[PDB]
Design a protein around this nucleic acid. Sequence first.
DNA 1: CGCGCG
DNA 2: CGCGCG
Lengths: 61, 61
Amino acid sequence: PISEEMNLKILAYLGTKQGAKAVHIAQSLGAQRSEVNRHLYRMSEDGRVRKHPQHPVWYLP
Amino acid sequence: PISEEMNLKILAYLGTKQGAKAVHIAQSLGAQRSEVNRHLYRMSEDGRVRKHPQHPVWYLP
DNA sequence: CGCGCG
DNA sequence: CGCGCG
């Protein structure tokens, strides 16, 4: 499922970086890569985060 | 697979009608709804299209 | 190697 | 009912 609280933890982390990989987001939150990726991709649908067009690297809009 | 040619056709439809549903894009292009959605969701990852936060309706940023 | 998939 | 899933 989707945790809005997980969404907010990810957004807060991205707010401290200039682009980040899910593996490092997961490391820094103490979460699993799959959970972080599930949330990143869903947030990207409506524009809350954005992925590099070629690389698995994530940014705030 | 993902066709960049298909991406451009979908973007062109959206440029004509904001707030479109996949079924209507598919009808116009002569494609399957599932194919159109596969491309919409992948384009949403890097912000080329954007989904409505609550509905399967699509916008062009 | 991109993987998120329920 | 959101479904895109390979």
